[PDB]
Design an enzyme around this catalytic site. Structure first.
Site, short mmCIF file in Angstrom:
data_model
loop_
_atom_site.label_atom_id
_atom_site.label_comp_id
_atom_site.label_asym_id
_atom_site.label_seq_id
_atom_site.Cartn_x
_atom_site.Cartn_y
_atom_site.Cartn_z
N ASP A 36 -12.33 -27.33 -13.85
CA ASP A 36 -13.03 -28.37 -12.97
C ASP A 36 -12.65 -28.53 -11.58
O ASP A 36 -13.22 -28.85 -10.53
CB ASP A 36 -12.75 -29.75 -13.88
CG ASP A 36 -13.05 -29.74 -15.17
OD1 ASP A 36 -14.33 -30.03 -15.75
OD2 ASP A 36 -12.19 -29.51 -15.96
N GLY A 92 -15.17 -28.41 -23.24
CA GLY A 92 -14.91 -29.21 -21.97
C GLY A 92 -14.94 -28.43 -20.75
O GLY A 92 -14.47 -28.97 -19.70
N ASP A 149 10.03 -20.41 -14.98
CA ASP A 149 10.78 -19.27 -15.11
C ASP A 149 9.69 -18.16 -15.52
O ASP A 149 8.62 -18.38 -15.60
CB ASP A 149 11.75 -19.25 -16.45
CG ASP A 149 11.06 -19.66 -17.92
OD1 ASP A 149 11.73 -19.77 -18.63
OD2 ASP A 149 9.99 -20.24 -17.74
N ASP A 196 -2.64 -2.58 -28.93
CA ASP A 196 -2.35 -1.15 -29.35
C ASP A 196 -1.37 -0.68 -28.66
O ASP A 196 -0.42 -0.12 -29.29
CB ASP A 196 -3.75 -0.44 -29.44
CG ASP A 196 -4.48 -0.52 -30.77
OD1 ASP A 196 -3.84 -0.72 -31.89
OD2 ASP A 196 -5.82 -0.80 -30.58
N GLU A 221 8.31 -16.33 -18.30
CA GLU A 221 8.39 -16.11 -19.78
C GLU A 221 7.26 -15.17 -20.16
O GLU A 221 6.34 -15.13 -19.37
CB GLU A 221 8.13 -17.42 -20.62
CG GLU A 221 8.92 -17.44 -21.83
CD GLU A 221 8.50 -18.38 -22.77
OE1 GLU A 221 9.13 -18.62 -23.84
OE2 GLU A 221 7.62 -19.06 -22.26
N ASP A 243 0.99 -1.23 0.00
CA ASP A 243 -0.04 0.09 -0.01
C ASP A 243 0.79 1.04 -0.03
O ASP A 243 0.51 2.36 -0.42
CB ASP A 243 -0.99 -0.04 1.11
CG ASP A 243 -2.16 0.69 0.92
OD1 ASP A 243 -2.86 1.51 1.73
OD2 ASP A 243 -2.96 0.43 -0.28
CA LIG Z 1 -13.74 -30.38 -18.77
CA LIG Z 2 11.07 -20.44 -21.24
#
Ligand SMILES: [Ca+2]
Ligand SMILES: [Ca+2]
Ligand SMILES: [Ca+2]
Ligand SMILES: [Ca+2]
Ligand SMILES: [Ca+2]
Ligand SMILES: [Ca+2]
Ligand SMILES: [Ca+2]
Ligand SMILES: [Ca+2]
Ligand SMILES: [Cl-]
Lengths: 329, 329, 329, 328, 329
Positions: E167, E219, E195, E107, E197, E21
């Site tokens: 799930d 799914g 890492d 953008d 990335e 903060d």
């Molecule tokens: Ca699923």
């Molecule tokens: Ca990597």
RNA sequence: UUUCUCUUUUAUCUU
RNA sequence: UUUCUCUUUUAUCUU
RNA sequence: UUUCUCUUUUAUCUU
RNA sequence: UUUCUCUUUUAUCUU
């Protein structure tokens, strides 16, 4: 300190799964550091359950070394203890079936034997300060699973023998060594190996009730009954070497006692080569003399239970006792 | 200053006026002229208890071995009547000492003598639901006998145990502690005799008046029913005044709490008893402690709020040192 | 030298190999990894006993809790037969711990583990009337089970407790002590396992083979009858080898004596038991004592004449110091 | 520190080749120093494998029995319709009598130290076919509780082997190679300590007589047969070795099978075996932690070729861990 | 001890595990091998929020840039279903960085990478009206794709973004923090990759499953709807596990609170952006911090009550110094 | 989980 | 990519 | 009923 | 709104 560096990675993890809070212990540890190093499967069982207590009724909760079941409960008339007229119903850990099937004769399908490491429990009140009432009492009983022998007037006449829970009678009195505070303060407590070493226990087939089917409570000596119900949903797969935690929760008339109930279980199983479980197994941790003597000390040192409040302060309280006794050595 | 007391003589004064939650061996014994073999039994009860609204619940801390207290509730603003019966709440392991038949009490031990009798009530309800009060006074209840004739063939004269002084429970004694329920309470009783004489174990007693005896013949104002001979009973009456506790719960009041009871008792063990293994000689006379005991007792208040249960031992030590000061002048 | 042992670790070695007539608190406990709450029960029997002439009286010091020994006499020059039944002689206060019904043993305690098992026979006859001998050997008697079928409707398969290794009593073991009766004897048994594991209390057992079971089905060579369930019984089987004592009294021989038996046993108390009051944590691991225990045991003779009962503690200390010497090199 | 004579012998009986005139040794070096009798059980079995069959050999901790054998059609595993028959070690009867109630007559209890097995192909090089596969199962002897509607109604409890369901599939941790290459494997204590197990009376079949295979949960059956020739005298704490010799059609698979077993029994004073008894070796911390380490390090099994280069595999591991701990 | 960390390396560890903060420049950046130009964006949300009674409100702290959290309520005692849709609550100035059309996100910035993701819930209700609990666990939610065919002319095969691991929200993870509502909670997430990335900004995403896509094809168990492309949207998915928070409000319970969210994110600015003005080189590699980060993360609890939000920075420093200690040995 | 003195007061190990 | 002082002026680490 | 040291090893009284 | 050291770690003013 110089105590935390003597322990092996396993040895440390072990001590945490044992007395550490559920949140701090993100890693169940490779298991028990002892002479045994064979193939096993570490499974840290955790149950979270929003439970509300019946008013004007004392509810008893029993934590036992039974695989796949967190605890057993039963409610009785306020101010009273279980009777012959009482029966405890088990609450399963998630996926009990995925471990011990759905028929009383398919428990040893996934795993053959087991051994408990830690067995903790906690109650976290969620009632407001205008609704809570009652108390939470806790003590531990040395309940073990034995057997009883008696004759039967059949034809021809024969002698029986069945499983009996010995020392169950301890649940009918609050032993001098106990925790007992206002409901609102919650409670937190663990249990430990009631044996000099961590010997494996066999998985038990066909056990659904105790006294079992066709046996009078009278012939078993057990003060009350244990019913796991439909073999397809629950059951008694075995009995570990951990004293059983007993909990009396008194709810007055007109009192709203809502709380969350948690349960830990660091269990080491012997996976069956066929089980779709086996691929998660590894070898048991190597002996860690230190961790083992620490375990024993910490265990005997810690209080029966503590209020829910200092559940986190737990791990620390422990780390203290270790340096304290490892310093005097 | 407190070094004029023998080790036991001091221990004695603690088992007596302080709740020794501390795990000392439970008491040494009584520093009286008697030094024969005894067994210091430290009885302790932890009972969660909810009080029904609109009822004035009465609790009796009587010098009946194996039973922590007796209770019964009467409508608010009223006291016990002939229509009332008190049911005993036993300390843990009652049967483990007195058997399961009204004629097997003297099996384990033959006589006894109380040393301490303390009791505390610790509220567990919230501050928005409680209401009511806790009132306390002590009654000189002794156990005498009643002599009356019976029209049998041939006509004969009877004699049975009757409790004298019970009428003291039908009113709030002037010497009393009364305060809000929520404030709890702690109080203890003391030897109502000039010395610590032993009392015999009483066989066959299960109810007063005894079965087959019409109430009022005895002159008792109400009844005492210990129940099944195999679960509880009346094994004797100590020389301690009985503690009376009236907890009036107004209508719609959620008053719950935890009750604790302590009792240091010297029993004379029987060689055939296993219990006998833990027998030791009673402490040698400690003139100072016996004179302090008396002084401390006379000083302390009828009772005090639960909060001052801690400051208890301290309050005592100061009364002693204050008494030992005046002894120099 | 004997300062490498913890206070208990030493006490332990004494309760073990020496008759501690000395009134120490009876033992501290076992210096093993286990440190949970237990109760050290010091069982001691003093039995005056006259041996019938022309009979070879057999005595068995078995690890059956609450029973000092079992005996039966067979004609001189002979051993037990199928026609033989051994009757138990209980230590004082058997019922005070195990109740009066074959289903109330697990009431007071749940499990146990022996630490010591000593026995001595001190002749009381004169030097002109005695005759005969005392022979002693030890048997690896364990308590297994037998599986057999029964022609009932429907036909079923049974399983009951059977004592294995009893056949060892039918002959005088090669490793044995044998000497004139008048010389008495002292001997003790030891843990027949690599560790001190706890055994469960067994409910319902009163006879072996069990009632309704034909002898020989079990394969036992003779019978064990504890008698009335309200006076004695078989509550468990410890991991101690059983001590066999054959006292052959020739014709017209006046052989009387006094038998003494000692048994340090760690029981797991039940909170509802009064006995629980005397529970303490088991002693912490004392690697040295556990290694000495083993060494001392292996060294000592099968048994020795009654006279050397005193020199016992001394004989032990020397074996220890002698062992601790070789440990420096 | 170093090992004791017994502690070393103990490690040899444990993983040492039996062609080394292995010393039974004085036994197991642990806290226990009680009287016991060491027995080095050895069985040599010439055996021909049925073509088009998958023969299953089980090495179990059953005293006096070298192995249990059953056969099923190639490509399949045992079924409810299967029964395993035991092949006894020499002199089974001399130890456990001829009655299902004469087992505890010579010895009261026991504990296993080693349990090895070897298969040495005797087939020529064109006649043979198939493969040998090995994995181990944590089979333990438990109990089952079920009710029976008799008069009056009762509850029945009996022995039941748990973890057999592991034989109905090839465990991931397994050895698998051409039949001809033979095989050698061993098992170890499946418990942290070497506790004694009792001798069991009356056991001849599992499921026992009058019990349906359905009541037990056991996937198949175990039959020892005539109580006068064999039987189940106890179940030790050693994982059970499973060997699947897959013989195809027209395959001539002949070979010799050897079975080792170092067992420590508690002799009955009356038994003839008692004279031979000595005291269990004193605890030898080193060996007890080596045993544990060597065990975990060794492979499931190896081709019979490396049966002699076995002892040297061990000596290597012994000093390779006595090296990561010898530095500091 | 904490002087082995570079200035940024330390700052980094703070932005990470502590609610800063404190008005530092919001973070320095990540002490990783990458040192190209980035802009440290310190996202912070303050949301007042009232929870509807009888509903179990679910909140997801996902690594979706510009959105603090997503929520939806399901009836008490239940979890999300296919019938559920989560609506995002954006941090301030969402549009000021990602425009107002699903095709103008890239953008301002092109890629990004999270560093911290913290969240706290501070109860604002009184102690008489609140009730309920706050449960927390974390899910390894990643953003993959689903491949399926479509019957068009000509028939073709599709491929779209689908969220895997969702799930995990349908059940209370075993590794979790659960406690009374009133106690609030603080918890943070960490990089679920070895890492740091960079991830690409994703154009066009507004809903998952995407419009024109039937749920279940993907799914996913439920739906994610950011709403108007001109108010919010899904610009990317960071490599942080998602934080799940279940706040169950019982019937008639007045549970209100304030939620705060923090997010240190390194974005790769575009030269044409004004935002680019505040770009600086990423901090140089600080091997120590990267190793601490990992250690601290693994240590901390799933979550802690709101109260310990302060003691947070301190709790961290101690874990570090404690880790740096073991590094000397 | 904290700090020692003091006498405690038992308890063995050693002459 | 070069050299220090000086006060800068923020910024944490420590009592 | 005998003699002390030594460390025991608990246990309170006192700061 | 409180107390300094310490290294911080940037930042200009000066040779
Ligand atoms: Ca699923
Ligand atoms: Ca990597
Ligand atoms: Ca019972
Ligand atoms: Ca008198
Ligand atoms: Ca009257
Ligand atoms: Ca064991
Ligand atoms: Ca036999
Ligand atoms: Ca099965
Ligand atoms: Cl829940």
């Amino acid at each position: 300190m110089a105590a935390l560096t003597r322990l092996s990675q396993p040895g440390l993890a072990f001590l945490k799964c044992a007395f550490a809070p559920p949140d701090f212990n993100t890693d169940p540890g490779k298991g028990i550091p002892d002479r045994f190093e064979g193939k096993v499967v570490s499974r840290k069982d955790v149950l979270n359950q929003s439970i509300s207590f019946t008013a004007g009724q004392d509810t008893f909760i029993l934590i036992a070394p039974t695989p796949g079941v967190a605890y057993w409960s039963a409610s009785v008339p306020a101010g009273t203890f279980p009777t012959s007229a009482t029966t405890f119903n088990p609450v399963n850990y998630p996926g009990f079936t995925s471990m011990f099937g759905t028929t009383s004769t398919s428990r040893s399908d996934q795993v053959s034997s087991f051994r408990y490491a830690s067995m903790n429990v906690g109650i976290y009140p969620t009632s407001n300060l205008m609704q809570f009432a009652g108390s939470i009492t806790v003590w531990k009983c040395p309940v073990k699973l034995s057997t009883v022998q008696f004759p039967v007037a059949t034809d021809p006449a024969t002698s029986s023998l069945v499983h009996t829970l010995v020392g169950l009678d301890g649940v009918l009195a609050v032993g001098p060594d106990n925790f007992s505070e206002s409901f609102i303060k919650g409670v937190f407590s663990q249990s430990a190996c009631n044996e000099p070493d961590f010997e494996f226990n066999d998985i038990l087939e066909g056990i659904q009730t105790l006294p079992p089917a066709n046996v009078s409570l009278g012939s078993t000596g057990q003060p009350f009954t244990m019913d796991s119900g439909a073999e397809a949903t629950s059951g008694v797969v075995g009995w570990g070497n951990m004293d059983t935690i007993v909990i009396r929760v008194s709810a007055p008339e007109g009192a709203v006692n809502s709380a969350i109930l948690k349960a830990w279980s660091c269990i080491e199983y012997r996976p069956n080569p066929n089980a779709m479980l086996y691929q998660f197994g590894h070898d048991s941790p190597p002996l860690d003399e230190v961790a083992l003597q620490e375990y024993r000390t910490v265990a005997r040192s810690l209080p029966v239970a503590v209020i829910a409040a200092q559940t986190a302060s737990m791990w620390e309280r422990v780390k203290s006792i270790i340096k304290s006794s490892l310093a005097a050595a």
